[PDB]
Design a protein around this ligand. Structure first.
Ligand SMILES: NC(=[NH2+])NCCC[C@H](N)C(=O)O
Ligand SMILES: O=C(O)CCC(=O)C(=O)O
Ligand SMILES: [Fe+3]
Length: 335
């Protein structure tokens, strides 16, 4: 809580002795702190700062242009400050969401799969910066998933077998400065996939909740057990202090389900600061068609990830044209 643990990942994870020891240490760090940091090399750091710069430049565009970067096929594109709701309350960052960039010629888009479509990019320079960043983030996610399997003494590709053509996506965020009566950036929530890899500038605002002995956690993938808003005003909340040259990593709903709670989907929230805050949250996700399964309970329960993703994003954006078209064309009922 006072100081987060920081790890260096190897370029390749093969299953050697050092890989197993590192994977164990990563799991223990999650089980104690709910989060850890990983050191970035010069290339990872450059691509991070390049993405932040593109984010700041895009936010300087007029609102009428930013609001035009929307799609009714995919949730990729702009989200205005105040548009997204968490636990019914408006969240206040402006966001650009980057999901899998699929042309209208892609077979899944022609088949009308929910959430599948081309990103409404503001320009190609912004596109190149975000795609390059997400390639680098994906390499880290695969390393982390192999180390996580090794740390549980599972076959090395237990999780990466679910992430071939994974539904990886990213939220490019700018939080506005606070007012005297409003400091809620995003309410307490958990993410939906396997891993969250996050970067931030030096302003500060992210808080996470570590595992708490005796504290039962809602299973955000079940009806009536949303994690949105839970524990929001009760300690403990660890401040994720801005630290140069690191990314933060914590698990999502799928890891909690697959490990039977031995890993918890880390609740987190953002408070507005006295200055605007830029951050990027990347989500290393299963394939949209993947079905996650219990690893430690020899059980019929499954999570169809794509269904979880679509359910979650419709609850984030009930009035977005993407949500309207899913309802109008029964795209989720179809799924
Ligand atoms: N699309 C997201 N990842 N949103 C993160 C914030 C929480 C989200 N509004 C929810 O209700 O679950
Ligand atoms: O602001 C951050 O660092 C993370 C924001 C976040 O949790 C999210 O967008 O899901
Ligand atoms: Fe989040």
């Amino acid at each position: 809580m006072t100081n987060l643990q920081t790890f260096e990942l190897p370029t390749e994870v093969t299953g050697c002795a050092a890989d197993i020891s590192l994977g164990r240490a990563l799991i223990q760090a999650w089980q104690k702190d709910g989060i850890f940091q990983i050191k970035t090399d010069s290339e990872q750091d450059r691509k991070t700062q390049e993405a932040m710069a593109a984010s700041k430049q895009f936010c300087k565009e007029p609102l009428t242009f930013k609001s035009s970067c929307v799609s009714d096929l995919t949730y990729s594109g702009y989200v205005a400050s105040g548009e997204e709701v968490t636990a019914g309350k408006p969240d206040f960052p402006e966001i650009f969401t980057v999901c899998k960039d699929l042309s209208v010629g892609d077979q899944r888009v022609k088949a009308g799969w929910p959430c599948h479509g081309p990103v409404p990019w503001p320009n190609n320079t912004y596109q190149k910066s975000m795609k390059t960043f997400m390639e680098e983030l994906g390499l880290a996610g695969e390393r982390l998933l192999k180390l996580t399997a090794l740390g549980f003494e599972l076959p090395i590709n237990t999780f990466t077998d679910l992430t071939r053509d994974g539904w990886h996506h990213m939220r490019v965020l700018r939080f506005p400065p606070q007012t005297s009566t409003l400091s809620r950036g995003i309410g307490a929530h958990t993410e939906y996939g396997l891993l969250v890899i996050a970067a931030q500038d030096d302003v500060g605002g992210l808080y996470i909740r570590p595992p708490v002995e005796g504290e039962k956690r809602n299973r955000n993938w079940l009806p009536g057990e949303s994690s949105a808003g839970m524990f929001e005003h009760d300690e403990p909340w660890t401040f994720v202090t801005p630290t140069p040259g690191v990314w933060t990593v914590f698990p999502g709903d799928i890891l909690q389900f697959m490990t039977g709670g031995q890993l918890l989907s880390t609740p987190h929230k953002v408070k507005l600061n006295t200055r605007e805050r830029f951050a990027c949250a990347y989500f290393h996700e299963p394939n949209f068609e993947a079905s996650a399964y219990p690893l430690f309970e020899p059980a019929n329960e499954r999570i169809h990830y794509g269904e979880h993703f679509t359910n979650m994003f419709m609850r984030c954006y009930p009035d977005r044209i993407t949500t309207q078209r899913i309802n109008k064309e029964n795209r989720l009922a179809h799924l």
